[PDB]
A paper describes a structure:
We report the X-ray crystal structures of these domains in complex with relevant sialic acid variants revealing the molecular basis of how each catalytic domain accommodates different sialic acids.
This opens up the 9-O-Ac binding pocket that was otherwise blocked by F353 allowing [name],9Ac2 to be bound by NanIGH33 in a conformation similar to that observed in the NanHGH33 complex. When the 9-O-Ac pocket is unoccupied it appears that W354 blocks the region that would otherwise accommodate a 7-O-Ac (this position is the smaller P472 residue in NanJGH33). Though W354 moves when binding a ligand with a 9-O-Ac, the rotation of F353 would cause its sidechain to block 7-O-Ac binding.
Author numbering: 1243 to 1690
């Protein structure tokens, strides 16, 4: 229709960009200053997930609303097939700090062979990263100084990137397949930040000790973006979606969150904790032993009164949605299935929209509208209150009033952002692992 805007797709990442053969897992965020930040997995040896790869994090910035992009940069690189995989972007608007979080594996590990727990150990009241030598002997890193199992200082020290130094000389890296001392083989949540709108980034912070429990096997970023809560008693809280597996390997969604500008983090309950399944059964993410109720990758959006809605990848064939009245710490016992929104077991994206649509508050949603990874569709969901819960909190439902096909053919992971002009930017997996595509869409297009 006249006035509609749907730009010709541009390959924001692609074979050869930054000398990476492959790319996957898009993330896209407009900062408060108005810059677009796009992060991606730079997969160096094919499209495969960890451990069968060597994956780095890359970033591109646009300062003119997505029309042109900078030459990019690798911001996280571990050696020897130690991977960083699945990034997520959020900003603290009060301090102007941008956060990027990612899952990290030592060489040879990934979601299915991850060992149990955080890989940290408590000594006299402080968590310390554990290291292991060839014979199984366990060490701790105390302010980057390696102590043996008798709290004897050794000759070894580390840095944030895991380099291992013997008397101040680098010999290896605790994440490699060859280091004399290796970190525990498991998932780690890593955090970097930018104070200059994304131009430069800090070294990775290993926050596993605050968010990974003893009984979790894998705990990883649910890729895409986070939020900072805008209304109510938890305003200012930074919410980052995650998901984890238990001993039996079953997956459950959650968010980690910080109320002190990213300094400390906690993990909330999963919507699977005390979940009431359809016919009344009560399960828990800790004990979950069946595949059916699994909740995995997810993204979160805020309702007008500050209530949280977690959109979750799952195994029912349809979108699943959890609700939290307490800023992400727990969820209502009922997980809703929207049979208006197919979910073929793939990552999805959902963001708040800043302006009313047809007089209603709205969200924007992206995913493959099929039983396969195809038929990529952006939707406008209008929020309606439909009564209240027993506890008197409002009950919110979505009306998927506008549904627009934007990518025929292959469509997998995606990430949305609202643009300074009020339009919608989208970075999506239009190929399985090569070209990653960026387009801009106005609501006139989406409503057509
Ligand atoms: C492997 C990983 O850390 N992330 C990958 C994730 C994951 O393997 C999938 O969610 C299943 O997780 C679990 C714990 O069973 O899913 C993808 O493999 C996919 O596109 O299906 C891409 C993504 O990078
Ligand atoms: Na690397
Ligand atoms: Na560390």
């Amino acid at each position: 229709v006249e006035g509609a805007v749907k730009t010709e797709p541009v390959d924001l990442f692609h074979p050869g960009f930054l000398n990476s053969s492959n790319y996957r897992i898009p993330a896209l965020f407009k900062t408060k200053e108005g810059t677009l930040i796009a992060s991606i997995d730079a997969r160096r040896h094919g499209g495969a997930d960890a451990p069968n790869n060597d994956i780095d994090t890359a970033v591109r910035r646009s300062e003119d609303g997505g029309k042109t992009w900078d030459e990019g940069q690798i911001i996280m690189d571990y050696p020897d097939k130690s991977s960083v995989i699945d990034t997520t972007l959020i900003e603290d608007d009060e301090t102007g700090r941008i956060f990027l979080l990612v899952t990290h594996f030592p060489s040879k590990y990934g979601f299915w062979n991850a060992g149990l727990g955080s890989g940290f150990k408590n000594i006299d009241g402080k968590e310390y990263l554990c290291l292991y030598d060839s014979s199984g002997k366990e060490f701790t890193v105390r302010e980057n100084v390696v102590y043996d199992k008798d709290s004897n200082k050794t000759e070894y020290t580390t840095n944030a990137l895991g380099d291992l130094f013997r008397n101040g000389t680098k010999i290896d890296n605790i994440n490699s397949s060859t280091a004399p001392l290796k970190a525990k083989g498991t998932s780690y949540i890593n955090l970097v930040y930018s104070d200059d709108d994304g131009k430069t980034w800090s070294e990775p912070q290993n926050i596993n000790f605050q968010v990974k429990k003893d009984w979790m096997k894998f705990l990883g970023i649910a890729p895409g973006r986070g939020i900072q809560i805008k209304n109510g008693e938890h305003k200012g809280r930074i919410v980052v979606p995650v998901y984890y597996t238990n001993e039996k390997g079953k997956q459950s969604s959650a968010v980690i969150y910080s109320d002190d500008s990213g300094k400390n983090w906690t993990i909330g309950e999963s919507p699977n904790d005390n979940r009431k399944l359809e016919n009344g059964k009560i399960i828990n993410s800790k004990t979950l032993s069946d595949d059916a109720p699994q909740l995995t990758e997810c993204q979160v959006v805020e309702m007008p009164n500050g209530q949280l809605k977690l959109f979750m990848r799952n195994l029912s064939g349809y979108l699943n949605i959890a609700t939290s009245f307490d800023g992400g710490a727990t969820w209502d016992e009922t997980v809703e299935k929207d049979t208006n929104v197919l979910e073929p077991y793939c990552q999805l994206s959902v963001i708040n929209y800043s302006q009313k649509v047809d007089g209603k508050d709205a969200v924007i949603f992206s995913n493959p509208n099929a039983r396969s990874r195809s038929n990529g569709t952006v939707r406008i969901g209008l929020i309606n209150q439909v009564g209240t819960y027993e506890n008197g909190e409002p009950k919110y439902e979505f009306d998927w009033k506008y549904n627009k096909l934007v990518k025929p053919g292959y469509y997998a992971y995606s990430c949305l952002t609202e643009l300074s002009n009020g339009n919608i930017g989208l970075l999506y997996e239009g190929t399985p692992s090569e070209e990653m595509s960026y387009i801009e869409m106005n609501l006139k297009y989406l409503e057509s």
